[PDB]
Amino acid sequence: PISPIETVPVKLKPGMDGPKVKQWPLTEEKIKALVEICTEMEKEGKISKIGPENPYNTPVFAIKSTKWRKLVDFRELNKRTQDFWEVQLGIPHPAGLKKKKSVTVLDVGDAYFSVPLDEDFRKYTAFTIPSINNETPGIRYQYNVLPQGWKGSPAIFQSSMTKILEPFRKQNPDIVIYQYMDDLYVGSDLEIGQHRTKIEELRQHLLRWGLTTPDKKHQKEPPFLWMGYELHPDKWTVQPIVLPEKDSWTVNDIQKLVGKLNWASQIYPGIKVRQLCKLLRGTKALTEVIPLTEEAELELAENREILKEPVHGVYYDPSKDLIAEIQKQGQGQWTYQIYQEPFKNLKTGKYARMRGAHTNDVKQLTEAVQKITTESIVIWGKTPKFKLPIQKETWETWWTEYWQATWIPEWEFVNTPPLVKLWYQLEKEPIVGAETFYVDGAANRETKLGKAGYVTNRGRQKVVTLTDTTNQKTELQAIYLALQDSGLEVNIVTDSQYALGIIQAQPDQSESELVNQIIEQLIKKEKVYLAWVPAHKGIGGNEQVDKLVSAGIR
Amino acid sequence: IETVPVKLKPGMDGPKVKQWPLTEEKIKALVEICTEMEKEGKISKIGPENPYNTPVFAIKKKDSTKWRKLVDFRELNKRTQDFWEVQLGIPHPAGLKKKKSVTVLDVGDAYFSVPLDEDFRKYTAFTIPSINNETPGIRYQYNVLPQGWKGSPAIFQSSMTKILEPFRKQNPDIVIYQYMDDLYVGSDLEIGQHRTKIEELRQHLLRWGLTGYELHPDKWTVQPIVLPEKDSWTVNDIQKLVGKLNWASQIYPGIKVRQLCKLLRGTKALTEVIPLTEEAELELAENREILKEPVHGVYYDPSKDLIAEIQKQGQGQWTYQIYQEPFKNLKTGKYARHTNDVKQLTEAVQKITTESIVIWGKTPKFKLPIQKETWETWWTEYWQATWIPEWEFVNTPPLVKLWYQ
Numbered sequence: 001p002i003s004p005i006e007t008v009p010v011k012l013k014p015g016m017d018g019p020k021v022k023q024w025p026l027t028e029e030k031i032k033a034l035v036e037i038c039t040e041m042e043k044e045g046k047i048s049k050i051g052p053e054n055p056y057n058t059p060v061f062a063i064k065s066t067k068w069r070k071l072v073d074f075r076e077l078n079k080r081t082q083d084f085w086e087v088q089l090g091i092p093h094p095a096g097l098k099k100k101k102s103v104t105v106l107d108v109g110d111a112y113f114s115v116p117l118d119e120d121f122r123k124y125t126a127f128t129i130p131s132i133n134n135e136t137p138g139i140r141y142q143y144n145v146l147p148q149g150w151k152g153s154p155a156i157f158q159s160s161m162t163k164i165l166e167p168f169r170k171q172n173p174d175i176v177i178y179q180y181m182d183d184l185y186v187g188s189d190l191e192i193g194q195h196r197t198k199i200e201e202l203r204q205h206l207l208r209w210g211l212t213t214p215d216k217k218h219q220k221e222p223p224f225l226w227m228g229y230e231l232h233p234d235k236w237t238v239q240p241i242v243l244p245e246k247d248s249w250t251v252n253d254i255q256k257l258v259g260k261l262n263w264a265s266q267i268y269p270g271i272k273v274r275q276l277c278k279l280l281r282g283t284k285a286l287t288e289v290i291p292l293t294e295e296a297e298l299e300l301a302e303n304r305e306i307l308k309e310p311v312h313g314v315y316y317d318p319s320k321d322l323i324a325e326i327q328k329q330g331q332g333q334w335t336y337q338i339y340q341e342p343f344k345n346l347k348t349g350k351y352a353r354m355r356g357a358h359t360n361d362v363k364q365l366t367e368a369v370q371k372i373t374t375e376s377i378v379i380w381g382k383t384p385k386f387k388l389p390i391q392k393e394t395w396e397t398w399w400t401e402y403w404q405a406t407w408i409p410e411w412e413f414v415n416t417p418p419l420v421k422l423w424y425q426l427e428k429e430p431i432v433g434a435e436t437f438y439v440d441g442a443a444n445r446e447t448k449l450g451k452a453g454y455v456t457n458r459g460r461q462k463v464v465t466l467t468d469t470t471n472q473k474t475e476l477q478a479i480y481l482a483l484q485d486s487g488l489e490v491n492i493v494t495d496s497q498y499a500l501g502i503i504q505a506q507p508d509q510s511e512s513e514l515v516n517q518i519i520e521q522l523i524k525k526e527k528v529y530l531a532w533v534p535a536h537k538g539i540g541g542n543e544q545v546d547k548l549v550s551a552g553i554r
Numbered sequence: 555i556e557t558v559p560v561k562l563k564p565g566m567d568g569p570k571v572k573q574w575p576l577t578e579e580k581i582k583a584l585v586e587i588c589t590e591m592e593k594e595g596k597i598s599k600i601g602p603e604n605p606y607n608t609p610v611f612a613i614k615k616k617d618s619t620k621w622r623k624l625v626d627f628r629e630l631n632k633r634t635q636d637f638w639e640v641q642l643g644i645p646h647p648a649g650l651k652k653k654k655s656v657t658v659l660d661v662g663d664a665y666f667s668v669p670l671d672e673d674f675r676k677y678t679a680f681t682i683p684s685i686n687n688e689t690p691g692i693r694y695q696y697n698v699l700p701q702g703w704k705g706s707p708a709i710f711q712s713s714m715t716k717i718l719e720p721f722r723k724q725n726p727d728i729v730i731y732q733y734m735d736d737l738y739v740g741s742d743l744e745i746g747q748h749r750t751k752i753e754e755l756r757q758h759l760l761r762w763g764l765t766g767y768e769l770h771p772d773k774w775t776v777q778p779i780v781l782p783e784k785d786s787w788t789v790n791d792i793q794k795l796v797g798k799l800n801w802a803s804q805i806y807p808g809i810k811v812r813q814l815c816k817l818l819r820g821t822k823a824l825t826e827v828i829p830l831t832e833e834a835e836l837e838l839a840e841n842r843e844i845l846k847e848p849v850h851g852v853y854y855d856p857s858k859d860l861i862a863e864i865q866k867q868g869q870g871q872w873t874y875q876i877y878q879e880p881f882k883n884l885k886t887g888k889y890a891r892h893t894n895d896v897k898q899l900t901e902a903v904q905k906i907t908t909e910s911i912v913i914w915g916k917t918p919k920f921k922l923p924i925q926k927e928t929w930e931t932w933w934t935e936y937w938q939a940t941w942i943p944e945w946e947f948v949n950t951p952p953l954v955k956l957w958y959q
């Protein structure tokens with residue numbers, strides 16, 4: 001049965017004609033297998049014979065566990081076909097679904113082959129069964145329905161199924177139907193008897209539209225394995241995750257493990273991947289063995305422990321608020337959970353992202369909130385109420401003084417260490433009784449060598465030589481010198497906007513080990529005031545460290 | 555009625571811009587709005603064979619409880635710039651910025667009485683998404699001039715002129731400028747008299763279907779770079795002063811620092827009070843004078859885009875500069891304030907855009923001191939305007955903020 005549904009008009013891309021690819025000669029057994037397949041398809045309205053008048057062509061092949069299959073290579077027609085609207089804009093997350101009393105899945109029989117193809121387009125679907133040893137013509141057909149492997153099939157199928165379902169939906173708004181490829185998931189809160197009854201009424205409304213579906217006795221029982229998930233009407237989990245037992249790990253084994261651990265992270269809280277991931281850095285062939293670092297071994301063990309014993313999530317109650325909680329798991333690692341009723345998770349997740357080169361826990365926490373806020377809008381249409389391991393004073397102090405704008409949705413502090421905090425502060429004013437260090441760095445672009453140094457108001461001076469640097473590196477090297485030689489309380493004056501910008505943002509972690517050394521020093525001080533002056537002016541101490549540091553390096 | 559043919563920019567396709575995720579209440583407001591437009595024939599449902607897309611949102615719109623649908627035609631506007639700008643461009647009047655009073659009126663309803671060329675409709679496609687992607691998006695395209703598309707005012711131009719004709723004849727000294735979905739009405743009348751003429755204008759629009767915001771461009775003055783005035787100057791204070799002066803120059807010609815720097819010779823402590831040799835005081839003396847005046851040499855170039863930079867100053871304050879060439883400031887200003895950073899930045903942007911429309915007839919491309927994603931999720935929460943400017947996301951330079959405080 002081909003559906004009586006109206007047809008979707010189709011077009012070739014602008015300034016293009018249909019495909020005209022010649023048919024390769026086939027073996028006799030293949031021609032034969034194809035003649036049988038087509039006569040059957042023709043005797044069902046799926047395809048139709050045409051002549052040598054239509055000028056387009058698409059290759060056909062035949063392949064074989066011992067039954068023949070027809071293969072049409074639509075590559076060329078696909079390149080000439082217009083673009084369509086995307087089939088799915090995203091897939092639902094199970095955490096966002098509502099709990100259901102009864103749920104069934106109907107798989108649509110011969111999906112594509114039940115929807116008609118635009119009359120004016122059929123012509124470009126022309127294929128030829130060749131004659132024996134090519135001597136002679138060939139049998140020529142064209143499609144009447146949506147072809148397997150054709151660009152427009154998926155979208156046209158789904159649109160047709162959407163048009164066909166509307167009538168039913170209106171008369172049964174208390175019923176959910178989700179369209180996925182050629183399956184239909186049907187959910188209701190009805191008693192088993194009236195659900196079975198509404199299915200049948202559905203199965204028959206579809207039948208009237210040229211679409212077949214399995215009957216009771218033939219339709220599967222929950223749990224439904226779908227998209228890597230296992231769905232029960234009252235709960236959800238990810239499909240069974242087996243972490244292999246291996247004596248030797250190859251890159252391909254670590255990549256697969258990492259992907260399974262990332263997948264499990266949606267519901268198993270605390271899953272970690274950073275040490276395992278560090279191992280995939282650099283990398284050789286997919287086949288090369290990688291010794292597991294210690295760290296990697298502890299992470300695996302910790303993950304293994306989290307994974308023994310199933311964990312399931314609950315579904316969404318739209319009448320209740322969503323609560324999201326976040327914990328710092330370590331350096332750059334964040335983990336979160338979302339619930340509506342304390343401790344019954346709808347879902348879990350982790351966030352790691354390094355945003356920039358130098359950063360702090362205040363900025364990372366706030367980026368994690370943003371990532372969760374976005375995900376929430378997607379899954380539930382609303383933002384959650386957050387519980388953060390950061391004191392309210394800490395947050396407002398930071399957001400208030402920083403130069404970038406921000407806004408978090410409603411949140412409350414929660415005492416779950418480690419608590420988020422700033423590790424040092426720069427003074428707003430120069431320290432009285434503090435030695436002033438005027439710093440500077442210089443680097444030669446040709447030789448790549450440079451010098452970093454300082455001159456203080458209290459007599460001191462120093463210049464150090466560096467060999468494979470950059471100006472930026474010298475300027476940071478200069479600041480570090482001043483922090484090493486100064487003792488608590490110091491005033492540092494630099495001409496580097498670059499180094500200033502970095503330090504003013506109160507970094508606690510960096511990609512640069514030099515930056516990390518500066519940070520470790522900054523946390524040790526009592527008071528640090530840092531200021532900037534334009535280079536190449538007469539500015540006191542500056543003009544002096546500049547000449548000192550320029551010597552031989554410009 | 556007949557339709558004006560519309561073409562894209564040669565070898566240029568339609569927009570295929572992703573629909574951002576919307577909250578439950580904005581999705582429901584849109585479903586409601588769109589169901590009513592469709593019933594009235596303004597838009598129709600479309601098939602999978604339309605691969606185009608333009609984003610859509612819902613806004614409240616100044617002191618109104620009602621939801622307004624807002625279509626983001628930024629991309630389509632880019633793909634149709636020869637049509638609305640060269641083919642059917644709307645002249646911008648230079649006298650507008652001079653009027654004492656400018657009133658902004660929303661005239662977008664005018665558009666739905668005009669039909670859109672059948673062969674262009676497909677490019678106006680947009681989608682209403684569902685939560686969790688549990689159902690397919692509701693797909694539509696327009697049958698009439700859409701709001702937010704710069705082709706609509708260009709096409710409706712002739713009818714607008716017929717409509718405003720008697721009022722303009724009767725009031726030779728009032729300037730009326732259309733920009734996108736709004737009308738800008740300026741006069742030099744006393745305020746009650748200005749408001750009276752505005753109500754009269756509303757009566758004329760009302761005879762043709764159509765059915766405000768109050769500026770004072772003439773009162774749009776300065777916003778210099780200010781220098782500190784003080785007794786007892788520190789080494790630290792002097793450095794900060796030359797730093798700011800040094801930066802002031804590059805934009806301002808004449809700024810001098812030698813004397814200020816001469817004050818700083820040797821390797822001094824920051825907390826060292828240093829008496830200003832009169833030679834110096836005469837320097838920031840003339841600099842202070844330099845800074846109080848305008849640029850000189852900077853003019854608007856109509857063939858160039860306008861850029862706007864904004865700095866978060868703290869405690870409700872924001873600074874901004876509009877220019878085409880960096881350092882060649884056409885305008886500078888400030889904006890001051892339940893208000894978060896996003897809500898305040900959102901109002902500053904709309905405020906800067908409106909002045910820019912009034913002054914030059916075009917919107918600036920904004921460089922926003924905010925994380926993209928934060929802006930993306932929050933902006934429509936406080937957006938009230940019917941247009942949307944172009945924007946980028948930047949990280950404010952450390953000193954730039956202090957130099958504009």
Ligand SMILES: NC(=O)c1[nH]c2ccc(Br)cc2c1S(=O)(=O)N1CCCC1
Pocket residue numbers: 092096097098099100103176177178185186187222224226231232233234315688
């Ligand atoms: N729309 C829903 O809220 C919904 N809720 C469910 C709960 C459990 C099961 Br099993 C299926 C469901 C469904 S469903 O059947 O539509 N569909 C399952 C795949 C994604 C949505």
